[PDB]
Amino acid sequence: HHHMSFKPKIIVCGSPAELSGVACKKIVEIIHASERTNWPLSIALSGGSTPKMLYSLLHEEHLHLLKEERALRFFFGDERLVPADAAESNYNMARQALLRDIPEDLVVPVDVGCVGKVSKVACNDAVKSADAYEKKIALLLGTQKVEGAEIPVFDIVLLGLGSDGHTASIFHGSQAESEMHRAVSVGFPSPTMSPKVWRVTLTPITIIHARHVILLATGKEKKCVLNGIIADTPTEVPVSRFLRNCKGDVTFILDKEIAENLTC
C-alpha cells in the first residue's frame, strides 16, 4: 500500500511505576524462550531511573536465574566517559542495583580508564574507548555479515527515549547518528541534554540487528518524539526514527500520558 508500516508490540501501563514490572516480565520471557545451551543471552543495558528500577526488580525477584543459572551477559548500550564509581556512570548504577551479585565474566563494562589518564576527555579518547569495547563485544559474542561489515548480534537491547527523542547516546550531530558499519561509536549530548560528557554508544546498525529490542518511554512531554517514530508520514522526526528499521522483535512499553495519540 502507500506507506511502510511499523508494527512494534505496544504495551501501555496505567501507572508509569508499572513499566519496570512489564520490562522485567518481557526480559524473563525472552530468557525462558531460549534453550539453556544458548545462555548466557547478551543484553545491552540502558541508564536512567526506570532501568535502575528494572535492575533492582531483577535483583530482588530473579537473582537465582541471573547468578546461579547464568542466564544473561550484561553489556552497556552506552556509557559516560566519567569514572566507573561516579554518579553519572551507567555501570555504577547497574552495579549498585544488580551487577554486584552477578558472576564477573557475565559483567562487561566499557573501559573508562582514559578518564584521569587525561585532564579533559576529547573525541579521540571516546573513539579509542569505542574501538576497545567493539573488540570486547566481538570476542565475547562473535560477529556476522549482515545486509550483504561484521556486526555482533545482541539477544536483547534495552533502550530509553529521551525528551529530545535520542536513544542510547545516539544524538543528531553525533558520529553515531547514522553509523551503519561500526558496531560501537561515540556521541556528545545536544545543547538541552546533560551530563555534558563524551559517551561510547552502540550504533543504529547494532540495534537494527538485535534479536529483541525493548524501548521504555514515559511522559506527556515525549509524546511528540514518540509520534515521530510511530507515525508513517510525519514531516519532522527524532534521531530514534531508525528503530522502524529494526530486524528483530520490537516492544515499546509506554505509560498512558505518552500513549494518548496511539491506537495502542
Side-chain angles (χ1 to χ4, degrees):
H1 239 229
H2 287 189
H3 308 300
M4 308 272 288
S5 287
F6 173 53
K7 306 277 150 130
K9 173 73 182 153
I10 295 170
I11 310 168
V12 180
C13 317
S15 29
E18 194 194 329
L19 271 82
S20 40
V22 176
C24 185
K25 182 171 185 185
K26 187 47 144 183
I27 291 155
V28 170
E29 270 166 7
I30 293 167
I31 292 169
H32 292 323
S34 208
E35 290 189 326
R36 279 174 171 82
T37 59
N38 300 320
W39 302 5
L41 303 182
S42 51
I43 187 161
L45 302 181
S46 57
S49 41
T50 298
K52 185 193 156 204
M53 287 165 71
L54 162 57
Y55 308 157
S56 311
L57 185 48
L58 287 166
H59 184 261
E60 315 318 341
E61 288 180 6
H62 297 288
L63 194 46
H64 186 267
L65 176 58
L66 300 181
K67 167 181 218 286
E68 272 65 41
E69 293 193 53
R70 301 173 44 82
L72 285 180
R73 197 192 292 283
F74 295 97
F75 296 81
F76 292 82
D78 70 332
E79 186 55 283
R80 289 78 165 284
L81 286 159
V82 297
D85 50 7
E88 276 152 27
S89 169
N90 291 335
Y91 173 57
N92 180 60
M93 176 275 275
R95 186 205 110 252
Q96 289 173 156
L98 171 60
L99 298 184
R100 59 189 162 84
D101 284 318
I102 300 305
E104 67 172 54
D105 74 300
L106 291 191
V107 179
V108 196
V110 173
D111 206 67
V112 297
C114 82
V115 185
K117 298 273 197 76
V118 83
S119 41
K120 262 128 61 72
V121 174
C123 189
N124 195 66
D125 296 303
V127 167
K128 284 166 58 175
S129 183
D131 297 346
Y133 201 55
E134 194 149 344
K135 296 162 209 134
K136 200 182 271 166
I137 298 171
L139 178 70
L140 288 167
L141 302 196
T143 61
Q144 53 187 248
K145 270 280 194 314
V146 295
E147 298 180 348
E150 239 160 295
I151 300 296
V153 172
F154 277 94
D155 291 303
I156 311 181
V157 172
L158 267 170
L159 297 177
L161 194 67
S163 50
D164 69 342
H166 85 278
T167 190
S169 282
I170 307 167
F171 293 98
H172 277 145
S174 65
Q175 296 80 6
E177 173 181 342
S178 329
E179 175 60 81
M180 286 311 157
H181 295 287
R182 308 313 330 158
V184 194
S185 191
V186 300
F188 195 91
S190 291
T192 66
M193 297 294 116
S194 305
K196 301 303 193 178
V197 294
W198 275 104
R199 295 105 173 269
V200 175
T201 184
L202 299 183
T203 60
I205 190 55
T206 302
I207 295 166
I208 282 164
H209 281 92
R211 298 193 177 95
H212 307 267
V213 174
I214 304 168
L215 179 76
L216 298 196
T218 58
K220 193 193 164 85
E221 75 273 6
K222 297 196 188 82
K223 190 150 96 343
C224 183
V225 291
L226 180 62
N227 295 338
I229 309 166
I230 285 172
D232 296 335
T233 229
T235 289
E236 300 280 351
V237 299
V239 70
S240 64
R241 185 71 179 174
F242 73 81
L243 293 173
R244 294 175 65 92
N245 291 145
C246 280
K247 296 290 177 45
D249 153 62
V250 178
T251 310
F252 286 16
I253 309 182
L254 309 180
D255 79 330
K256 292 286 192 236
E257 286 290 320
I258 201 173
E260 328 208 56
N261 299 315
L262 268 51
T263 50
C264 333

